[PDB]
Amino acid sequence: STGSATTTPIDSLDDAYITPVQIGTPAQTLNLDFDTGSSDLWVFSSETTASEVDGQTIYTPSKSTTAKLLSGATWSISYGDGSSSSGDVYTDTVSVGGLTVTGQAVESAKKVSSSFTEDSTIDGLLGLAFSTLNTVSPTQQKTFFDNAKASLDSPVFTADLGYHAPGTYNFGFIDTTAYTGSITYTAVSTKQGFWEWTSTGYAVGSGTFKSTSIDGIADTGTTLLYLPATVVSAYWAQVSGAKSSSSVGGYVFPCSATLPSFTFGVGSARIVIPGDYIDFGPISTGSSSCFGGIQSSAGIGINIFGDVALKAAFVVFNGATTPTLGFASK
Numbered sequence: 211s212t213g214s215a216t217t218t219p220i221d222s223l224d225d226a227y228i229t230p231v232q233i234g235t236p237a238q239t240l241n242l243d244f245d246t247g248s249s250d251l252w253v254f255s256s257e258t259t260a261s262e263v264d265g266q267t268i269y270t271p272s273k274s275t276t277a278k279l280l281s282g283a284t285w286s287i288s289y290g291d292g293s294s295s296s297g298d299v300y301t302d303t304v305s306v307g308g309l310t311v312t313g314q315a316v317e318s319a320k321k322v323s324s325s326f327t328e329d330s331t332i333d334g335l336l337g338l339a340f341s342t343l344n345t346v347s348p349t350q351q352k353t354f355f356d357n358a359k360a361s362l363d364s365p366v367f368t369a370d371l372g373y374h375a376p377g378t379y380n381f382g383f384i385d386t387t388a389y390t391g392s393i394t395y396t397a398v399s400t401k402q403g404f405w406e407w408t409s410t411g412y413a414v415g416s417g418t419f420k421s422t423s424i425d426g427i428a429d430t431g432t433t434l435l436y437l438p439a440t441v442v443s444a445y446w447a448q449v450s451g452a453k454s455s456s457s458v459g460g461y462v463f464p465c466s467a468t469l470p471s472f473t474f475g476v477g478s479a480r481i482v483i484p485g486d487y488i489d490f491g492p493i494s495t496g497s498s499s500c501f502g503g504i505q506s507s508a509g510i511g512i513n514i515f516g517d518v519a520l521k522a523a524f525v526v527f528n529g530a531t532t533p534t535l536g537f538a539s540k
């Protein structure tokens with residue numbers, strides 16, 4: 211079996227991608243952020259504290275015939291940006307893109323932080339990292355993908371993010387029309403439960419490639435590219451008024467710059483992020499100072515290939531028994 215769903219940026223900087231998902235019987239449609247660095251499917255719900263919901267679409271398990279409370283399960287997550295949510299758990303049927311999974315744990319928020327409340331177009335998350343990270347206690351629950359994987363023609367999904375434009379997640383199959391040339395696949399480490407891989411090095415603009423291993427995670431739920439403070443200095447040194455800013459917390463640059471591209475290595479292959487994908491945009495409505503898309507990881511403590519990097523590529527998460535990550539140009 212297969213499924214094919216359209217994800218669409220939430221805003222005109224592609225800060226994040228929402229993808230329609232059907233939960234329950236009959237279907238409730240919520241739009242979920244597809245998250246490869248987390249392993250919880252959680253949703254806005256009927257049980258969500260009322261003062262914390264603001265225009266989001268809520269799951270009402272009371273209305274679904276397939277919904278069962280999972281008695282005493284609780285869950286509680288917190289993420290890189292300090293956002294958090296917790297609450298209780300049903301199981302229910304979930305479809306993505308035609309692909310149906312029965313008995314999926316759907317974690318129902320009771321309490322979300324302010325950051326969630328603020329973001330009206332995201333009605334919760336669909337984790338796609340490794341099931342080890344799921345936070346439901348006391349019985350850890352499986353991911354959407356792990357539940358599908360039985361049924362799948364092929365235990366891969368693929369991510370094909372767009373630059374200011376809709377893009378597609380596919381389960382079960384590789385669209386050989388979606389990419390040019392060949393996919394290079396590269397080993398994953400599951401140890402910390404991330405799709406963990408190692409980049410082969412980098413180029414700035416039309417500079418020389420440096421060979422150098424950068425360990426990072428492929429993370430569709432993280433907006434920017436976060437690189438070691440060395441790699442990142444190299445890049446912004448090539449941008450005329452660019453500097454590191456304490457008030458902004460970041461690398462800023464005059465909006466009037468052109469950015470050079472960034473190449474990252476995948477085995478012997480090279481992926482090139484066009485300069486314009488790096489252009490985040492104005493830091494504050496009407497400032498002549500723009501925020502960059504390439505940011506240092508020193509403070510976070512892993513390297514993240516976020517959406518800037520992965521929208522440059524057609525990406526396969528091959529969830530075989532030995533997982534791999536495949537990258538191709540498109």
Ligand SMILES: CCCC[C@H](NC(=O)[C@H](Cc1ccccc1)NC(=O)N1CCOCC1)C(=O)N[C@@H](CC1CCCCC1)C(O)(O)C(F)(F)C(=O)NC
Pocket residue numbers: 225226243245246247248288289290291292293329335429430431432433434510514
């Ligand atoms: C500092 C490094 C991590 C930050 C990363 N978040 C991000 O990258 C959020 C994504 C977002 C877009 C729109 C609205 C709200 C959030 N964006 C963000 O912080 N910025 C600030 C810089 O401008 C660009 C957008 C993150 O926490 N990713 C989570 C999942 C998200 C959490 C917040 C809601 C959206 C999804 C993650 O699961 O992928 C994780 F790996 F980082 C994680 O915490 N695993 C436990």
